[PDB]
Each structure stands twice: as C-alpha cells, then as structure tokens.
Structure 1
Amino acid sequence: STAGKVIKCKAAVLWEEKKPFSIEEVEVAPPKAHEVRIKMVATGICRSDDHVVSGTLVTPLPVIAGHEAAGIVESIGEGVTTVRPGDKVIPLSTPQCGKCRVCKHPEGNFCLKNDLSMPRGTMQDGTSRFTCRGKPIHHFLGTSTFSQYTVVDEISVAKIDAASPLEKVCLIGCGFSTGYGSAVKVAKVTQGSTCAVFGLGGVGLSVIMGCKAAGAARIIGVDINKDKFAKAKEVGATECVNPQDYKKPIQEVLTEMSNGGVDFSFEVIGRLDTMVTALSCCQEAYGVSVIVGVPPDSQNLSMNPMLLLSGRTWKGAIFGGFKSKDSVPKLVADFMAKKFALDPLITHVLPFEKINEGFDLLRSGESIRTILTF
C-alpha cells in the first residue's frame, strides 16, 4: 500500500536550536537505489540528540534527529541485498560500508562514510528524503529516527532477530553498545582491575555493565547527581562519589582511593574538564583512560603532556569500537541469550507524541533512557 509512494507521517522536527521538537506531518520519499525505508517501532532518547538541541553538537538544521532505534523494513530500493520488507532492523549512526580502509582494518570502526566528521545531514547521495511544510529537512547521522518512517542507506542498517523485543533492543543501536564496548573492546578492562566511570547516565551505566562483565574488582561511579548512585550500584558500581561533596579535586580523591590511580577510567559526560580529570586519575605509568562523552563544538582542552609521558594511554571511540553492521545483530543475539540486561537502563516508556516530556526528563536528571513508542 505504501511501496514506491511518498508517505505522509508524523515526525518530530527541530527547526532551530534551543526549541522544543515540533510534532507535525512530514513527507517521506520512497527509497532510491541501495536505500531502505523503515517503519519505526521504538526510539531511545540519547544525550547526543539533546546536544543537537543545545548547540553542543553542530549538524545542519532543520533536522529530524533521533538515532537510537529499532523498526521494521517497509520497502527497499533497487540493489538492496541485506534486508527485506518485514525484517526487524536497527539503524546505525556509524555505517559499515565494508570497503574503506577503516572497515577493512581489524580494529577500526569509524567508517569513512560517516556523517559525523563533516556533517552534511543528507543521505549518502547528498540529498534528503524528508519534506515538511514544503521545506526540505536534514537527516541526522544517516538515521533520523524521531519519525514514524525514515529512509537510511543500506550501509547504515542492520537486520536483527525476527523475535527481538524492539522496545528494548533499540538501545543496542547506540547507548548500550557504546558503553559496553568502551569497557570490553576499547579499554579492554582486565580481571581484578579498578575502574572509574564519570557520568552515570545510560551510556555510563553500560560502561559499568561492561567493566563488571570484564571482572573488574572495583568500579567507582562519579556523578554530580547523587540520585544516579542507586542504579549505578545495582548494575555493578562498588562505590560512588559526588565531586561536589569534596573540597579537593576529584582526581586527587580517586588517586587516593585507588592507592595511586585507577587502572581504567572513562569520561562519559562530555566536558573538557572531566576528560582531563579522568585521564589524571588513572595510574601514571600504566593507566588507560577512554573518552566517550561528546565535547562542546570546536572547544579545545588544555593538558600537561607529562600525564602521557609517564606511561598513560588516552583513547576515545565511537560506538564502543564495534564495527556496527557486524556487531549489532550479534549483540541482539547475546541479549536474547541473556548475556546482558537492558531493563536497568530503561526508566520511562512513553508514546512518541510525548517526545518533549522525554527530553525534559533527561534534562532534569530524572531519567536514564526514555523509550518512545510509535
């Protein structure tokens, strides 16, 4: 009934920074060659979507944001081989083209077809499939999931188990896999180690899950919102500290608590000062610190390179280091085999129409992940 034909549907449009999302009708074009049109079933609210609203992350406006989601293929364009109508799918904000130097490298995952380094807010072909009030609307990270339907390039979608619960596994499309992989793949946390996790939102709790799965002996959660300590302990934190409770800098607190520095630290907030504090609190000769949080646009940090010369390792990653199209179906299979839990991340489930309330919940500190259901 809809294949080959323009779909009119509801979406949340962001016309301008620092405004509520506008829920209104949009026009979704049919998929061109190597494109996939998806009916959305559930989408999570990730802090990166809020960074578009706040100006922290710059991408062309107006835009349909949303990138952490799951849905069902409505139709495919000519030449698509990896998904078919009716398949359950997760869109991928980091593509996996399989052909570039990064996709061919055993470790790398930041495929050169990504829309993050030089954001265009289009399909791979440089055009948009969305119109609203007769105006073309930009895409976001090749995903755009705050819409009843979206169109994505084939390299930005993964087919998943037909029995998957989409209102939970949408988190594997971004926040869970990012945090979990940051611990198990990027840092390679070791049995018996001491970890410090700065930021106890959805991504930080997923880092804690990964540190616990790797056998860390101590996992210290750090957040300025003490309401986020109870859930952090439930998922594996052994202690939590609030920087605002201390007269001294938290890096010195954490160094003393760890008898000279932690083995692994994670910055899962997106602040320059906490990136430098997280580096400093890892042990100077052999510690490893991983940046996960998104820094504010165009701002540089300042640090003393003696922190590195003594032997620290500093790294960052997108999407937990996972090659996205290969890994997402495997992570869904692991969840269905009960290898990890997603329910601890989900504090609110709301109809899509309540998107702005979901963002208010995030900004107020009250939620971890809100899942929006279509």
Structure 2
Amino acid sequence: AKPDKNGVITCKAIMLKEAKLPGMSYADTVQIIDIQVDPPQNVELRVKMLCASVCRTDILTIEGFMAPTQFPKINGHEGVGIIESMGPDTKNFKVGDVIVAPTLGECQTCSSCRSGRTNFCQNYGANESALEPDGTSRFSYIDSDGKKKLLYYKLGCSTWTQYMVVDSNYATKLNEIAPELPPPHGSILSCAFATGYGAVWLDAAVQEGDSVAIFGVGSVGISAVIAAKELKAKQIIVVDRNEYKLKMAMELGATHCINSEKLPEGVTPSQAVRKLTPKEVGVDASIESSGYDVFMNEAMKAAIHGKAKTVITGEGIYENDRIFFDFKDFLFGGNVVGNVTGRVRIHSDFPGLLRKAQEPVIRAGMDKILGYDAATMKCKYEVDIREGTPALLKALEEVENVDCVKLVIKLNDY
C-alpha cells in the first residue's frame, strides 16, 4: 500500500476484539479489518510484511495470554518484512532491508548483555504494555460508529498485518547474509526455528555425543531435533502424542520416539526417557517445547541430575499462572531455565543462525517443517490475509490438524 499525504497507510490486519475464553469460537473474536498505520517516529521501522507464521503463542494470545487489558489488538510476533520507512533517528537500517524483530533486543552494554550467557537484555526487554512508551499506538481503526479507536500491539509490534511498526532496537536484517531466503523461512527464524535451534545450540549447549530429550515436536521441537542432529548428538529422544510429528522428527534425525498417550500404566514420560539411557541416568540436555505443564516437570526429571540443563520454551494458560516441579528430584539435581527465542541474541547470535539456516540439511529441515514448495513459494498450510475472514477462521481451526506443523499467513506479494 502507498501512504496518504500525512504518511498514514491503510491496510489489512487481523484484529482480536477480546480474549477467546474457553467455549468461545475464533468467529467470536477474530476479524480481518482495514487499519491505519501511522508513520514511524524516533528510531522506529515501518515494515511491509511478507508473511507471518502461526506460533502456538499466537493462539495463546487469541485466548488472552499476557493480555489482561490489551484488547482490541493486532495479533502476531512471528513474521518477516521489508523496511518501507524509518523514524528520523534510526541508525544501521535502510529502506528495502528485510528484517525480523523478536521480543528481546540486545543493547550490548547492560550486565546481562556483557555476561555473554543470556539474551534477556535489561534495556530492550519484552514490551508487555503492547503500546508505545507514551501510551499511543501506531495502529488505529474506524469502528462501525465512525470513531477512531486504538489497537494494541502483541508486545513491541504485531506481525498479523500488511504493515507493522517496530522499534529498530528489536530488528535484525536477513538480506545481507541471506538475500535468497524465502519469506516463510525468514518468518520461522523470527520465533519458532530460533527458539528450538537456540534452546539446543546455545542454552543446553549440546556437544557431539550428548543425549537429548525433546518434549513436544511442533515447529519448535522439530527445530530442536534439527539442531541436535547438526551438533551430532548420539541420541535424540522425542516425546509427543501426535504420531505425524513424531514421524517427522524421526525423519529429521530423532533416534527414539515415545508416544506419551500410549505409555504403560504407571510409566511416566521421564521414566520412559530414562529407560533408553545407560543405567537409566537420563539425558545430557532436556528441552521442553510443548506448553504442557506436566512435560515441564517430566523434562526436569529426564535430565542427568546436576550435570544436565532443562530448557523450558513452552507457554500456556496455567491455573494461578503457575508451573510445578517434583521437589525431591528438583533438589537432587534439578536445573531449569526459562528460554525466549532460543537465547539467540539478535546481533551476536542471529547472523550465525542465519548462515546455518542456508546450509542444505538445515534448509531441508525448514522446508519439511513448512512443507515448502520452491516452485510456487507456497507452504502446505497457508492462508492469505487478502482472502477474507472465513478462510482465516478455517485456517485457525486447521492449526490442530495432525499434519499442520506451521500455518503461514501470507500478507503481501513476495
């Protein structure tokens, strides 16, 4: 879209009217509407989005996750686009750059950045207000009563829109290192792939000859399998109840699979994992990527006491917003870390991830996650924001299809 004389763009975006509480439909809350996107201020990028792709956390967001008051909103944190314009103070970006902009920036000067061992930057942390720091939004719409109304972001931006505004301290560019990378690949690099790959590579720090357990092989868990295989793990144990995704995981380098719904009475997933290791010692690295609170506990219990790290990537709407651990196993060697975006720092680590993503085996793995067809640039599960709300609502139901690993939302021509 071309801006009007005041620099405002009118474009399609996916609006969430309110939380979809249990028993409510997508139809109750989700609608494609025309929105107005204000021009970028200060160090902001306004970004022509190519595609978004559906993270389970996007579905949690529809259900009200981390948004007690921040409706109506434009959804989405997983996506890729092209810089269309920039605020006047912007440095180190140009119009035409291809960017992703995940939740955490990297100031490189706080004690967290300088530690070398985390991406939880003190200066560019999660924008939980879902607003600009002055309480405004670059997004608005004209409702049925003709009134101009504010739309919240997801966090520091929204990706389910033809045009997004994001603070450039959260952006990192793809076009210098990977000018030929297709859009849906760039989209999963913004969250799902970075998360599973980085949880294994950076956070669990998997070494050649390590044993790895992965609880949940959706897009995040399969990304973890691809990393564990690249890093020459001796053993890659995948746990899930979805036989399709367990089989995909086995095709991309998992060595052992466990269907948690088919375990003998009184055999826990952690016991099943331990049974596959020498003297039932457990795994060198335990990844949770399910959102199932039970699996966070089972992941902790699967890890070799003291030596191994359990990396929790999963998210969900839990009773009292709490998770639980078996205390005796926890005290006697538990080691559990929260992980966002795989610990992949947007300046220090993302460039090497992007170079890795171009290696043939890693690309084949991304193609499999996406069911990508390079001839048509279409993914197996794809919906286009220009095709209207009914198509989108059907696609959101089909996220639960057994063979839907990653739904893609096409936003603009490629």
Q: TM-score range by the shorter chain?
A: over 0.9
User: What are the residue-to-residue correspondences of 1:189-200 with 2, within 5 Å?
Assistant: 189-200=206-217
1:34 alignment counterpart: 43
1:287 alignment counterpart: 308
Change in Cα spacing, 1:356 to 1:366, as seen in structure 2 (3 Å) is: farther
User: What are the residue-to-residue correspondences of 1:127-166 with 2, within 5 Å?
Assistant: 127-133=136-142, 134-161=148-175, 162-166=179-183
Paired letter, 2:222 = L
Contact 2:192 2:220 in 1 (8 A): yes
Once the two structures are TM-superposed, the CA of residue 115 in structure 1 deviates from its matched residue by: 5.9
1:371 alignment counterpart: 408
User: What are the residue-to-residue correspondences of 1:281-360 with 2, within 5 Å?
Assistant: 281-296=302-317, 298-338=320-360, 340-341=362-363, 342-347=366-371, 348-352=381-385, 353=387, 354-360=391-397
Which whole-Å CA distance do the structure 2 matches of 1:56 and 1:37 have between them? 26
58, 65, 71: which one aligns with 1:49: 58
Paired letter, 1:258 = T
Change in Cα spacing, 1:263 to 1:94, as seen in structure 2 (3 Å) is: same
User: What are the residue-to-residue correspondences of 1:39-188 with 2, within 5 Å?
Assistant: 39-58=48-67, 60-113=70-123, 116=126, 119-133=128-142, 134-161=148-175, 162-188=179-205
Which whole-Å CA distance do the structure 1 matches of 2:326 and 2:180 have between them? 51
User: What are the residue-to-residue correspondences of 1:230-249 with 2, within 5 Å?
Assistant: 230-246=247-263, 247=265, 248-249=267-268
Which whole-Å CA distance do the structure 2 matches of 1:357 and 1:83 have between them? 37
Once the two structures are TM-superposed, the CA of residue 124 in structure 1 deviates from its matched residue by: 4.1
Higher mean C-alpha displacement, 288-297 vs 43-52:
288-297
Q: Which stretches of structure 1, 4 residues or longer, exceed 4 Å deviation after superposition?
A: none
Change in Cα spacing, 1:74 to 1:285, as seen in structure 2 (3 Å) is: closer
Contact 2:192 2:223 in 1 (8 A): yes
Q: Is the partner of 1:55 in helix, strand or coil?
A: coil
Paired letter, 2:298 = T
204, 213, 221: which one aligns with 1:204: 221
2:10 alignment counterpart: 8
Change in Cα spacing, 1:114 to 1:272, as seen in structure 2 (3 Å) is: farther
Paired letter, 1:287 = A
Q: Is the partner of 2:85 in helix, strand or coil?
A: strand
Residue-by-residue CA offset, 1:214-265 (whole Å, 9 max, x unaligned): 2111111110121212211111111211111121222222222223122221
Structure 1, gaps ≥5 residues long = none
Which whole-Å CA distance do the structure 2 matches of 1:339 and 1:107 have between them? 27
Higher mean C-alpha displacement, 257-266 vs 161-170:
161-170
Paired letter, 2:369 = L
1:223 alignment counterpart: 240
Q: Is the partner of 2:321 in helix, strand or coil?
A: coil
Higher mean C-alpha displacement, 161-170 vs 259-268:
161-170
Structure 2, gaps ≥5 residues long = 21-25, 143-147, 372-380
Contact 1:200 1:221 in 2 (8 A): yes
Higher mean C-alpha displacement, 321-330 vs 151-160:
321-330
TM-score (ref. length: structure 1) = 0.93
Root-mean-square deviation (Å): 2.1
Once the two structures are TM-superposed, the CA of residue 363 in structure 1 deviates from its matched residue by: 2.7
Residue-by-residue CA offset, 1:131-165 (whole Å, 9 max, x unaligned): 02221000112120100001100112112224432
TM-score (ref. length: structure 2) = 0.84
Alignment length, in residue pairs?
373
